Design a protein around this nucleic acid. Structure first.
Lengths: 249, 705, 511
RNA sequence: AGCAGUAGCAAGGAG
RNA sequence: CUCCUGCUUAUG
């Protein structure tokens, strides 16, 4: 029943007169230069305007119906959380953020968060189970290399990743069929039994595929062995006048 | 007792006591007022270095043209900088260059460049800095100027179906063949313009004042081009980018530290029984007024001599657009009475009429620029301003550094945008006068002026190159900007992790010894806390956000698991800069707290780290009160259409949506295609399919009419 | 595919913009495809060599590195916005609920007794006395009635500029008159001054330990593993334990709290004159106390761009006698007597109108980032030391190592004061802070050129026989960018004395 | 007055 | 020189 909804929205937007000269006059590529119309120059002082923002009484734009579902108009001594000034979106204070964080409703979502961020929890689990030793205090230094810095086990090369996320999520407008498909299509048969029914949005799925298959290769000053497990530990293992390594396993 | 901070250098080196002499902690210099005198100083100072008087009349432009090549009137003052280039000399250096490495050098690099031009989409034009929009005559971002230019095309004659680089360039030249061009003015009226005014307007370059540059007492005018000059410059910078990546005595893309070790060891392995080496650190001054584009037309006609027929004509347009560029002259000056009370403003238009209200310096600079002024702009034909061909002049540097005169005394070195290090090998010191004066001779002939005041040399390595002072063994690091630590300012969740990211990238790239990184981490922690008003629970702060945290701290069981945005202590360290705060803390949070923070049903986030504090600040109030409210109406329409096209194609932000048919036609054919596919394995109902069909047909008849 | 659109005006554009010995682009393309080089090239090279007249300048034989020309004119005044060394502060224990700057101001109105703060209408020296007398009286009764908003009177209408702006008339109507309102423009430049003698005693005061303890609000320490985090924690704790007690930390705390307060007051209230304290907060015998140095007054900032230059009026508390040379821009009154237990000395109130700006608030309010270059420099010293000795010697290296600073006044030749490395880091946080205040154009150009002469002194240390191509224009640029900054002229004089001390051993210099 | 330095800020309008 | 016109609560 989604096609009736999209047909109602599409039939609603053609009711506008001057908007009909917008679409069917541009191109399919022009979506990119339709995405950016940022007529402000640079936002050249973001932390300055953020300190001026947090100094007021109501800096935040917040949803109304949820906060009138569960929040309170004022706390126990004059701490304001609400306005009635203007879509129905209501300004508020960051005391509502911390009050939501301390006296608000709770939904069990630990499995979803511990399944989207598998790369970073894998970094934490690889971080906790290491052991160090003494320093060395010697001169050290070596040139710049192109190093893949993540312990992936698939090692794609940033071309079958965009193509792979075309041929796993949404195949109706995916790609022309190349010769890079077949064995990766056995992997597609593996992946469609994973991302079939989930509450994860397709942009978040398109995020979470691209970080388990992509060894992040950057142009970095390295030294010693060039194993990719110790390349997120690049900045910790040695500097220019000092060095520390005692990893047994 | 007197006190002197410089005495540390009595028993140290300049690899340690050199960060002490940078004033990077104070305010950067800003400019004030108009930027007219800097532009007039640049244009008149350009024509004073031309060393000529040979004028050629023009049939296109209503102004005269002064030539810049092979027309020299040699004054005795040769140490004063010249802007005149001998083309047979530099082509002799090019033929001397390509016989050093390979034979088919420019055919190979030019064919790689042509291999990368053909596979380029013109959305690459929107990944740039600001440009000049000539429809409103303002400075705009790249997407807005490209969309107003394409808007002028699709409103003027026909529509645009290009979607490539070459067809957009061909569309620009077709706009040069058009007799009349229509665009929109401001309340959105539509105006027209003739033929020669469009030619005067496509070659217009805006100048402004360079704000916030560390290292000058006098100010400088920077220039930003239009839109019809940018893709050709992308072509030439791809070509010269491949040439500079192939050469081995340049330093622009980057390793810049191993090349100097290989040339110091390699040219120190090339010494006889009496020869030696002397290095000279230089700084080529007046660099942006001594590169004429006509020499780039000659060398750019020489590089592509056997490449193609498209590339041979496509790399010979941006020099021709640089040979006749106009320059915006800022916005004028101001006059005031004897009592300094009423102060009128004279813009750049009426500066010719009100000429008798100027100073000595303004009239001296204005009478030598007068036969080259249009109504608002100026005619420059030999300048190479900032924000242009950067990786092409470095090729001239490699050409001067690969000169062969035929003893056995010679030189080598390394080149940057305007910084070089030259190594000389000879036997005696008057022979050093001979060879160094030969180097200033070849640079002075080819059009490169070495400054005599900012140059020195020693025997071993004690030189300077892009502010990295290389001593006899050690290397000093680049003095970083401090305000790069705090420029995120968007969220209580994307600030502290962004600061750990910047400390990580400055630790890997630059030196940044560890206690400095712990210090900068702890200081950026304190600026985060003082900015967002969130302090630790054991502190004595009592504001409107610590009263709740001080009241509700009894409910949390394990106290060292709270967030830093919610009154927790610091748990990241130097060996934890690559893991964010939340992901480090989620093994110790209370489950009511963890299930309460990370709830996606929240009044703030609904409407790279985890989004749980991610709120949006309110907008301004003077954005809907000027005459530019309908511009916010236009971006509202663009966000509406982009939300619809995002709603049609479920995966559109991942891959670039290429195509050249229309947007709504791909919508209608897509809804009919998924309506057929989800029809035959799915739907099956006459009212639903016939109703969706009715809405598509009625929307199509409404759109077509 | 391989066809570019051969247009009409562009083909007349390319053929006109060729070099002068050429007719069209076809002729240039056919000549450049058929180019072969010759050996008349070296005749053009040597024919360019002959008409040169350029010689290099050695240094072992013509060591003309003269000391710089400090301008011998009137002395450069004290131009910093606040007072550093002549400060006096009133103390009380701090209340946790009463913490906002208006609350601190009223609580020090009852704490520091302003009833005895009697001012004569005739000052010691200065320019305007009656406006400052009426202004101090009006703001004193304004602090008495517990609201910080000055009612419109002619005193505030004269000091913080209201109605003092030019009528910017566009060029659409001009209404020309015969020989009346003759209008034009004229520029001058900047005024030139002389060598400051007061900067030395403020340097030596700025590094001397003050008994109030911790002044700077740092943050807590993260946990450490068995790594080098012990090392970084150790360096942070020793350097932190040295920089909290100095007077530079007191002035940084003054700038942070005061300019933070004036900054948020510039956000929340344009167009309205406020009353803002000038204060700190530090630990006295464990009790967290706060001070109060002066009273600042805003001047209705409408900050449109990053400029704007709104007017700040400063009333200051001093307990030393003035000076018409250093304290030149002030309007020194007399306030009364203060009981000072070691008997009852005097009390002088200073008056000064000045300006801040919106870009010159964020580089002041965040002036805690001066501990980053200091520890970088000290750690470059120590890590280069252990990197050359290849043994973990840091803990005894921080105690048994000297650093030559601070030669005396009557003699300079090889008469230096060797201090410990942490007293060096005291002097480093003093000089990085002095960069953090006095940064203008002149300090920038002077820092580039002193990097050049520092390269000459390093070349002199190792006997490399350096050389230069032109010494006239070099000193024309260094003598060009020394006009009126106190720190620039001071570091020029100290650069000359560096040339004397290095002249006592190496041979490239003068007397 | 003042900041500031190669030119601006120090409300806007009418006479 | 004379005369007419404004809201924004800030906590190292």
């Amino acid at each position: 029943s989604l096609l009736l909804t999209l047909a109602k929205e599409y039939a609603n937007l053609t009711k506008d007169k001057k908007s009909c000269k917008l679409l069917s006059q541009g191109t399919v590529s022009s979506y990119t230069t339709f995405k950016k119309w940022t007529t402000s120059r640079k936002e050249k002082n973001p932390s300055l305007r953020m300190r001026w923002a947090m100094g007021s009484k109501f800096p935040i734009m917040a949803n109304r119906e949820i906060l009138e579902e569960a929040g309170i108009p004022e706390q126990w001594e004059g701490i304001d959380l609400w306005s009635k000034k203007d879509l129905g979106m209501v300004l508020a204070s960051p005391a509502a953020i911390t009050y939501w964080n301390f006296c608000g409703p709770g939904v069990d979502n630990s499995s979803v968060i511990k399944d989207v961020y598998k790369a970073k929890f894998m970094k934490k689990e690889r971080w906790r189970e290491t052991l160090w030793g003494p320093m060395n205090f010697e001169l050290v230094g070596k040139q710049r290399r192109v190093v893949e810095t993540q312990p992936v086990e698939i090692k794609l090369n940033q071309k079958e990743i965009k193509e792979l996320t075309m041929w796993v999520l949404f195949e109706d407008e995916a790609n022309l069929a190349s010769k890079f498909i077949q064995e990766n299509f056995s992997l597609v048969l593996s992946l469609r039994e994973l991302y079939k029914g989930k509450a994860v949005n397709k942009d978040v799925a398109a995020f979470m595929i691209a970080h388990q298959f992509s060894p992040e290769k950057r142009f970095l000053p390295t030294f010693g062995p060039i194993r990719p497990e110790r390349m997120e530990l690049l900045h910790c293992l040695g500097g220019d006048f000092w060095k520390i390594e005692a990893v047994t396993a | 007792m007197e006190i002197n901070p410089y005495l540390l250098m009595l028993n140290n080196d300049i690899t340690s006591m050199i960060s002490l002499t940078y004033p990077y902690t104070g305010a950067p210099p800003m400019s004030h007022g108009t930027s007219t005198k800097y532009s007039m100083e640049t244009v008149s100072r350009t024509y004073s270095y031309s060393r000529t008087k040979k004028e050629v009349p023009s049939g296109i432009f209503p102004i005269e043209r002064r030539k810049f090549c092979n027309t020299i009137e040699d004054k005795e003052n040769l140490e004063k900088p010249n802007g005149n280039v001998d083309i047979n000399f530099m082509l002799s250096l090019a033929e001397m260059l390509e016989e050093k490495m390979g034979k088919g050098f420019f055919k190979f690099c030019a064919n790689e460049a042509e291999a990368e031009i053909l596979k380029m989409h013109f959305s690459k034009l929107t990944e740039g800095r600001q440009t000049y929009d000539w429809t409103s005559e303002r400075n705009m971002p790249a997407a807005t100027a490209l969309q107003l230019t394409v808007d002028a095309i699709q409103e003027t004659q026909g529509t645009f179906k290009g979607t490539t680089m070459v067809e957009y360039c061909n569309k620009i030249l077709e706009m040069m063949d058009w007799p009349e061009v229509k665009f929109k003015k401001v309340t959105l009226m539509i105006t027209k313009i003739g033929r020669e005014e469009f030619i005067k307007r496509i070659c217009t370059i805006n100048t402004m004042a360079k704000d916030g540059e560390r290292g000058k007492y006098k100010r400088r005018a920077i220039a930003t081009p239009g839109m019809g000059i940018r893709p050709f410059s992308k072509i030439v910078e791809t070509l010269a980018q491949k040439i500079c990546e192939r050469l081995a005595e340049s330093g622009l893309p980057v390793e810049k530290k191993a090349k100097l070790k290989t040339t110091v060891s390699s040219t120190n392995s090339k010494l006889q029984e009496g020869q030696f080496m002397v290095n000279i650190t230089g700084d080529n001054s007046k660099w942006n007024e001594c590169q004429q584009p006509e020499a780039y037309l000659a060398m750019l006609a020489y590089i592509t001599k056997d490449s193609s027929n498209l590339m041979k004509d496509l790399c010979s347009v941006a020099p021709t657009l640089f040979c006749n560029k106009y320059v915006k002259m800022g916005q004028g000056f101001r006059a005031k009475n004897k009592r300094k009370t009423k102060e009128i403003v004279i813009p750049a238009k009426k500066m010719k009429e009100r000429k008798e209200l100027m100073n000595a310096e303004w009239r001296d600079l204005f009478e030598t620029i007068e036969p080259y002024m249009d109504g608002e702009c100026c005619f420059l034909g030999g300048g190479m301003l900032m924000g242009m061909f950067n990786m092409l002049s470095t090729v001239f540097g490699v050409m001067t550094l690969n000169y062969r005169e035929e003893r056995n005394c010679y030189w080598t070195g390394l080149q940057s945008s305007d910084d070089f290090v030259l190594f000389c090998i000879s036997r005696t010191w008057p022979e050093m006068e001979m060879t160094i004066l030969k180097f200033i001779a070849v640079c002075k002939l080819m059009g490169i002026n070495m400054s005599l005041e900012k140059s020195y040399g020693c025997l071993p390595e004690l030189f300077e190159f892009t502010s990295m002072f290389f001593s006899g063994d050690f290397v000093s690091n680049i003095a970083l900007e401090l305000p790069a630590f705090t420029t995120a300012g968007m969220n209580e969740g994307t600030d502290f992790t962004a600061a750990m990211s910047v400390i990580r990238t400055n630790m890997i790239n630059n030196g940044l010894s560890p206690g400095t990184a712990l210090m900068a981490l702890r200081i950026c922690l304190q600026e985060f806390r003082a900015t967002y008003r969130v302090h630790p629970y054991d502190s004595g702060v009592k504001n409107h956000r610590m009263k709740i945290i001080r009241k509700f701290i009894e409910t949390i069981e394990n106290k060292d698991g709270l967030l830093i945005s919610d009154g927790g202590k610091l748990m990241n360290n130097i060996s934890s800069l690559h893991i964010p705060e939340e992901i480090l803390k989620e093994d110790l949070m209370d489950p009511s707290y963890r299930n309460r923070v990370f709830n996606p049903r929240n009044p703030f986030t609904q409407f790279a780290v985890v989004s749980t504090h991610s709120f949006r600040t309110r907008s301004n109030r003077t954005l809907l009160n000027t005459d530019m409210r309908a511009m916010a109406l236009e971006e509202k329409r663009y966000q509406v259409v982009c939300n619809m096209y995002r709603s049609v194609f479920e995966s559109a932000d991942v891959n670039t949506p290429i195509g050249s048919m229309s947007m709504g036609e791909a919508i209608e054919a897509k809804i009919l295609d998924r309506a057929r596919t989800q029809f035959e394995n799915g739907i099956i109902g006459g009212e639903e399919y016939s109703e969706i069909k009715r809405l598509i047909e009625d929307a199509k008849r409404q759109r077509l009419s | 595919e391989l066809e570019m659109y051969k247009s009409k005006l562009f083909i007349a554009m390319r053929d006109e913009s060729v070099p002068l010995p050429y007719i069209n682009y076809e002729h240039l393309r056919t000549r450049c495809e058929t180019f072969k080089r010759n050996q008349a090239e070296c005749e053009a090279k040597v024919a360019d060599v002959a008409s040169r007249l350029k010689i290099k300048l050695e240094h072992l034989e013509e060591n003309k590195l003269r000391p710089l020309e400090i301008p011998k004119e009137k002395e450069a005044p004290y131009t910093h916005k606040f007072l550093m060394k002549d400060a006096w502060f009133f103390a009380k224990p701090h209340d946790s609920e009463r913490a906002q700057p208006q609350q601190i101001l009223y609580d020090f109105f009852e704490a520091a007794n302003m009833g005895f703060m009697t001012t004569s209408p005739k000052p010691i020296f200065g320019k305007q006395g009656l406006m400052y007398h009426s202004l101090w009286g009006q703001t004193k009764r304004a602090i008495k009635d517990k609201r910080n908003e000055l009612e419109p009177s002619e005193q505030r209408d004269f000091l913080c500029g209201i109605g003092r702006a030019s009528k910017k008339i566009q060029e659409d109507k001009w209404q020309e008159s015969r020989e009346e309102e003759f209008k034009q423009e004229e520029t001058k430049g900047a005024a030139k001054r002389g060598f400051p003698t007061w900067f030395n005693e403020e340097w030596l005061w700025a590094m001397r330990d003050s008994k109030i303890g911790d002044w700077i609000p740092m943050a807590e320490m993260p946990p450490c593993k068995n790594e080098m985090e012990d090392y970084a924690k150790k360096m942070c704790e020793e350097l932190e334990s040295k920089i909290q007690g100095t007077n530079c930390a007191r002035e940084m705390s003054k700038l942070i709290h005061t300019i933070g307060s004036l900054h948020t007051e510039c956000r929340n209230f344009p167009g309205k004159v406020k009353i803002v304290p000038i204060y700190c907060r530090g630990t006295l015998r464990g009790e967290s106390t706060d001070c109060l140095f002066g009273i600042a007054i805003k001047g209705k900032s409408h900050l449109n761009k990053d400029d704007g230059m709104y007017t700040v009026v400063t009333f200051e508390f001093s307990t030393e006698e003035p000076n018409p040379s250093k304290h030149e821009k002030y309007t020194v009154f007399e306030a009364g007597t203060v009981p000072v237990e070691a008997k009852e000395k005097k009390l002088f109130l200073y008056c000064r109108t000045t300006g801040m700006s919106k870009l010159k608030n964020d580089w002041f309010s965040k002036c805690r980032r001066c501990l980053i270059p200091t520890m970088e420099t000290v750690e470059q010293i120590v890590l280069k030391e252990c990197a050359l000795k290849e043994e973990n010697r840091v803990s005894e290296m921080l105690e048994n190592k000297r650093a030559w600073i601070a030669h005396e006044n009557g003699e300079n030749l090889t008469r230096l004061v060797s201090t410990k490395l942490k007293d060096l880091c005291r002097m480093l946080i003093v000089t990085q802070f002095y960069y953090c205040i006095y940064n203008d154009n002149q300090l920038e150009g002077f820092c580039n050129e002193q990097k050049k002469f520092l390269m000459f002194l390093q070349a002199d240390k190792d006997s490399k026989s350096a050389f230069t191509f032109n010494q006239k224009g070099l000193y024309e640029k260094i003598e060009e960018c020394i006009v009126s900054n106190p720190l620039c002229i001071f570091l020029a004089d100290r650069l000359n004395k560096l040339f004397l001390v290095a002249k006592s051993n190496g041979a490239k210099y003068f007397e």
